[PDB]
Amino acid sequence: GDQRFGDLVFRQLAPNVWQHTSYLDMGAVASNGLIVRDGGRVLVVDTAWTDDQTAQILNWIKQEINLPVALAVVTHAHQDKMGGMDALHAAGIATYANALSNQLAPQEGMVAAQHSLTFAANGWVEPATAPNFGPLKVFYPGPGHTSDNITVGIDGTDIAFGGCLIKDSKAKSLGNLGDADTEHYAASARAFGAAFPKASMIVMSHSAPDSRAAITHTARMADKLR
Ligand SMILES: [Au+]
Ligand SMILES: [Au+]
Ligand SMILES: [Au+]
Protein backbone atom coordinates (compact mmCIF):
# COMPACT_ATOMS: atom_id res chain seq x y z
CA GLY A 1 0.00 0.00 0.00
CA ASP A 2 3.03 2.28 0.22
CA GLN A 3 4.00 4.32 -2.83
CA ARG A 4 7.58 5.49 -3.23
CA PHE A 5 7.99 8.88 -4.90
CA GLY A 6 11.52 10.16 -4.88
CA ASP A 7 12.86 9.53 -1.40
CA LEU A 8 9.40 9.87 0.20
CA VAL A 9 6.66 7.33 0.90
CA PHE A 10 2.91 7.94 0.59
CA ARG A 11 0.18 5.69 1.97
CA GLN A 12 -3.56 6.11 1.47
CA LEU A 13 -5.41 5.87 4.80
CA ALA A 14 -8.93 6.72 3.60
CA PRO A 15 -10.59 7.82 0.33
CA ASN A 16 -9.42 11.43 0.84
CA VAL A 17 -6.52 11.03 3.31
CA TRP A 18 -2.89 10.03 2.80
CA GLN A 19 0.11 9.81 5.11
CA HIS A 20 3.36 11.37 3.87
CA THR A 21 6.66 10.01 5.16
CA SER A 22 10.12 11.54 4.81
CA TYR A 23 13.48 10.40 6.17
CA LEU A 24 16.52 12.06 7.73
CA ASP A 25 19.78 10.39 8.78
CA MET A 26 20.32 11.12 12.47
CA GLY A 27 20.25 5.71 10.75
CA ALA A 28 17.33 7.14 8.80
CA VAL A 29 14.45 8.43 10.93
CA ALA A 30 10.96 8.52 9.43
CA SER A 31 8.56 11.38 10.11
CA ASN A 32 4.90 11.29 9.09
CA GLY A 33 2.37 13.96 8.19
CA LEU A 34 -0.99 14.02 6.39
CA ILE A 35 -2.51 15.11 3.09
CA VAL A 36 -6.29 15.64 2.89
CA ARG A 37 -8.41 16.16 -0.22
CA ASP A 38 -11.36 18.44 0.56
CA GLY A 39 -13.51 18.93 -2.52
CA GLY A 40 -11.51 20.94 -5.01
CA ARG A 41 -8.52 21.59 -2.79
CA VAL A 42 -5.81 19.86 -0.77
CA LEU A 43 -4.76 20.54 2.82
CA VAL A 44 -1.41 19.48 4.31
CA VAL A 45 -0.51 18.66 7.92
CA ASP A 46 3.23 19.04 8.64
CA THR A 47 6.15 19.57 6.30
CA ALA A 48 8.83 17.00 5.62
CA TRP A 49 12.25 17.32 7.29
CA THR A 50 13.62 19.51 4.49
CA ASP A 51 12.58 22.01 1.84
CA ASP A 52 13.60 19.65 -0.97
CA GLN A 53 11.50 16.83 0.51
CA THR A 54 8.55 19.16 1.05
CA ALA A 55 8.71 20.24 -2.60
CA GLN A 56 8.39 16.55 -3.45
CA ILE A 57 5.20 16.37 -1.36
CA LEU A 58 3.80 19.13 -3.56
CA ASN A 59 4.96 17.28 -6.68
CA TRP A 60 3.29 14.06 -5.53
CA ILE A 61 0.07 15.98 -4.85
CA LYS A 62 0.20 17.44 -8.37
CA GLN A 63 0.61 13.98 -9.90
CA GLU A 64 -1.75 11.90 -7.77
CA ILE A 65 -4.47 14.41 -6.83
CA ASN A 66 -4.02 17.36 -9.22
CA LEU A 67 -5.83 19.91 -7.04
CA PRO A 68 -4.36 23.11 -5.59
CA VAL A 69 -2.95 23.06 -2.07
CA ALA A 70 -5.01 25.62 -0.16
CA LEU A 71 -3.14 25.61 3.15
CA ALA A 72 -0.80 23.74 5.43
CA VAL A 73 -0.80 23.52 9.22
CA VAL A 74 2.30 22.47 11.12
CA THR A 75 2.13 20.93 14.54
CA HIS A 76 5.17 22.38 16.38
CA ALA A 77 8.44 24.20 15.77
CA HIS A 78 10.86 21.31 15.25
CA GLN A 79 12.60 20.25 12.03
CA ASP A 80 10.50 17.13 11.35
CA LYS A 81 7.28 19.22 11.32
CA MET A 82 8.45 22.64 10.11
CA GLY A 83 11.76 22.05 8.33
CA GLY A 84 10.21 22.54 4.89
CA MET A 85 8.31 25.80 5.41
CA ASP A 86 10.30 27.51 2.64
CA ALA A 87 9.02 25.09 0.00
CA LEU A 88 5.43 25.94 0.97
CA HIS A 89 6.04 29.69 0.95
CA ALA A 90 7.91 29.47 -2.35
CA ALA A 91 4.79 27.82 -3.84
CA GLY A 92 2.46 30.50 -2.46
CA ILE A 93 0.75 28.17 0.03
CA ALA A 94 -0.81 29.78 3.11
CA THR A 95 0.72 28.34 6.27
CA TYR A 96 -0.60 28.07 9.83
CA ALA A 97 0.87 27.16 13.20
CA ASN A 98 0.17 27.69 16.87
CA ALA A 99 1.08 31.32 17.67
CA LEU A 100 3.62 29.92 20.15
CA SER A 101 5.22 27.80 17.40
CA ASN A 102 5.66 30.94 15.32
CA GLN A 103 7.10 32.82 18.30
CA LEU A 104 9.53 29.97 19.04
CA ALA A 105 10.44 29.33 15.39
CA PRO A 106 13.58 31.55 15.22
CA GLN A 107 15.07 30.03 18.38
CA GLU A 108 14.30 26.56 17.04
CA GLY A 109 15.94 27.33 13.69
CA MET A 110 12.63 27.20 11.81
CA VAL A 111 10.92 29.61 9.44
CA ALA A 112 7.67 30.81 11.01
CA ALA A 113 4.34 30.12 9.38
CA GLN A 114 2.45 33.05 7.88
CA HIS A 115 -0.55 32.78 10.21
CA SER A 116 -1.08 32.02 13.88
CA LEU A 117 -3.68 29.84 15.57
CA THR A 118 -4.97 30.64 19.05
CA PHE A 119 -6.90 28.44 21.43
CA ALA A 120 -9.64 28.54 24.04
CA ALA A 121 -8.99 27.46 27.62
CA ASN A 122 -10.46 24.04 26.75
CA GLY A 123 -7.88 23.54 23.97
CA TRP A 124 -10.11 24.00 20.92
CA VAL A 125 -8.84 26.34 18.22
CA GLU A 126 -10.49 29.73 18.05
CA PRO A 127 -12.34 29.38 14.72
CA ALA A 128 -11.53 32.91 13.50
CA THR A 129 -7.85 31.87 13.52
CA ALA A 130 -8.46 28.68 11.46
CA PRO A 131 -10.05 30.11 8.29
CA ASN A 132 -11.46 27.57 5.85
CA PHE A 133 -9.83 24.63 7.59
CA GLY A 134 -12.58 22.35 6.26
CA PRO A 135 -12.29 18.91 7.86
CA LEU A 136 -9.17 19.84 9.87
CA LYS A 137 -10.23 20.18 13.52
CA VAL A 138 -7.31 21.61 15.49
CA PHE A 139 -6.89 20.96 19.21
CA TYR A 140 -4.17 22.17 21.58
CA PRO A 141 -3.95 19.43 24.23
CA GLY A 142 -1.52 21.18 26.57
CA PRO A 143 2.26 21.01 26.88
CA GLY A 144 3.78 17.62 26.22
CA HIS A 145 6.41 16.75 23.59
CA THR A 146 6.82 20.55 23.41
CA SER A 147 4.91 23.43 24.91
CA ASP A 148 3.55 24.35 21.46
CA ASN A 149 2.45 20.90 20.18
CA ILE A 150 -0.97 20.80 18.49
CA THR A 151 -3.11 17.93 17.21
CA VAL A 152 -5.55 17.60 14.32
CA GLY A 153 -8.68 15.53 13.82
CA ILE A 154 -9.88 14.79 10.31
CA ASP A 155 -13.64 15.35 10.34
CA GLY A 156 -15.71 12.86 8.36
CA THR A 157 -13.15 10.10 8.99
CA ASP A 158 -11.95 7.88 11.82
CA ILE A 159 -8.52 9.57 11.84
CA ALA A 160 -6.85 11.84 14.36
CA PHE A 161 -3.24 13.05 14.19
CA GLY A 162 -1.26 13.17 17.41
CA GLY A 163 2.03 14.30 15.88
CA CYS A 164 4.99 13.79 18.18
CA LEU A 165 2.86 13.83 21.34
CA ILE A 166 1.59 10.26 20.84
CA LYS A 167 3.75 7.15 20.43
CA ASP A 168 2.44 3.77 19.34
CA SER A 169 1.38 1.14 21.86
CA LYS A 170 4.58 -0.89 21.24
CA ALA A 171 6.84 2.07 22.14
CA LYS A 172 9.45 1.58 24.84
CA SER A 173 10.05 5.30 25.45
CA LEU A 174 8.63 8.75 24.80
CA GLY A 175 11.37 9.62 22.30
CA ASN A 176 13.13 12.97 22.45
CA LEU A 177 12.05 14.75 25.64
CA GLY A 178 14.61 17.55 25.26
CA ASP A 179 11.92 20.23 24.86
CA ALA A 180 9.20 18.34 26.73
CA ASP A 181 7.01 19.33 29.68
CA THR A 182 7.28 16.18 31.78
CA GLU A 183 4.82 17.45 34.40
CA HIS A 184 1.90 18.01 32.04
CA TYR A 185 2.63 15.40 29.33
CA ALA A 186 0.27 12.70 30.64
CA ALA A 187 -2.72 15.03 30.99
CA SER A 188 -2.06 16.44 27.51
CA ALA A 189 -2.02 12.95 25.99
CA ARG A 190 -5.30 12.14 27.73
CA ALA A 191 -6.80 15.45 26.60
CA PHE A 192 -6.04 14.55 22.98
CA GLY A 193 -7.93 11.29 23.46
CA ALA A 194 -10.90 13.08 25.00
CA ALA A 195 -10.95 15.72 22.24
CA PHE A 196 -11.32 13.07 19.50
CA PRO A 197 -13.18 10.37 21.43
CA LYS A 198 -14.38 8.38 18.40
CA ALA A 199 -11.16 8.40 16.35
CA SER A 200 -10.07 4.79 15.76
CA MET A 201 -6.97 5.41 13.61
CA ILE A 202 -4.32 7.42 15.44
CA VAL A 203 -1.62 8.80 13.15
CA MET A 204 1.67 9.91 14.67
CA SER A 205 5.04 11.27 13.64
CA HIS A 206 7.33 8.29 14.19
CA SER A 207 5.17 5.14 14.04
CA ALA A 208 2.71 3.58 11.63
CA PRO A 209 -0.94 4.33 12.49
CA ASP A 210 -2.24 2.57 15.60
CA SER A 211 -5.50 2.14 17.50
CA ARG A 212 -6.58 4.24 20.49
CA ALA A 213 -4.33 2.13 22.73
CA ALA A 214 -1.48 4.35 21.53
CA ILE A 215 -3.03 7.26 23.42
CA THR A 216 -3.49 5.38 26.69
CA HIS A 217 -0.12 3.64 26.51
CA THR A 218 1.57 7.01 25.89
CA ALA A 219 -0.25 8.62 28.82
CA ARG A 220 0.73 5.76 31.12
CA MET A 221 4.39 6.07 30.11
CA ALA A 222 4.11 9.81 30.77
CA ASP A 223 2.63 9.09 34.21
CA LYS A 224 6.07 7.67 35.09
CA LEU A 225 7.79 11.00 34.38
CA ARG A 226 6.16 12.59 37.44
AU1 LIG B 1 9.68 17.51 18.15
AU1 LIG C 1 14.46 23.41 21.27
AU1 LIG D 1 9.26 14.26 16.30
Numbering used by the authors: 42 to 67, 71 to 270
Reproduce passages from the article.
The Zn(II) ion in the active site of MCR-1 has been validated to be vital for the PEA transfer process; notwithstanding its biological roles in MCR proteins are still controversial. Our results showed that AUR irreversibly inhibit NDM-1 activity and disrupted the function of MCR-1 via displacing Zn(II) ions in the active sites and thus forming Au-NDM-1 or Au-MCR-1.
Au-bound NDM-1 was first obtained by incubating apo-NDM-1 with 10 molar equivalents of AUR overnight at 25 °C and then co-crystallized using a typical sitting-drop vapor diffusion method. Two Au ions, viz, Au282 and Au283 were clearly observed in the active site, tetrahedrally coordinated to Cys208, His250, Asp124, a water molecule (w291), and His122, His120, His189, and a water molecule (w410), respectively. The distance between two Au ions (~3.8 Å) is much shorter than that between two Zn ions (~4.6 Å) in the intact NDM-1 crystal. The occupancies of the three Au ions were ca. 0.5 with the Au283 in the Zn1 site showing slightly lower occupancy (0.45). Overall, the data agreed well with our biophysical characterization that the Zn-dependent hydrolysis function of NDM-1 was inhibited by AUR through displacement of the Zn(II) in the active. Our crystallographic analysis confirmed the binding of Au(I) species to the cysteine residue at the active site of NDM-1. Unlike bismuth, each AUR displaces one Zn(II) and tetrahedrally coordinated to respective three residues in either Zn1 or Zn2 site of NDM-1.
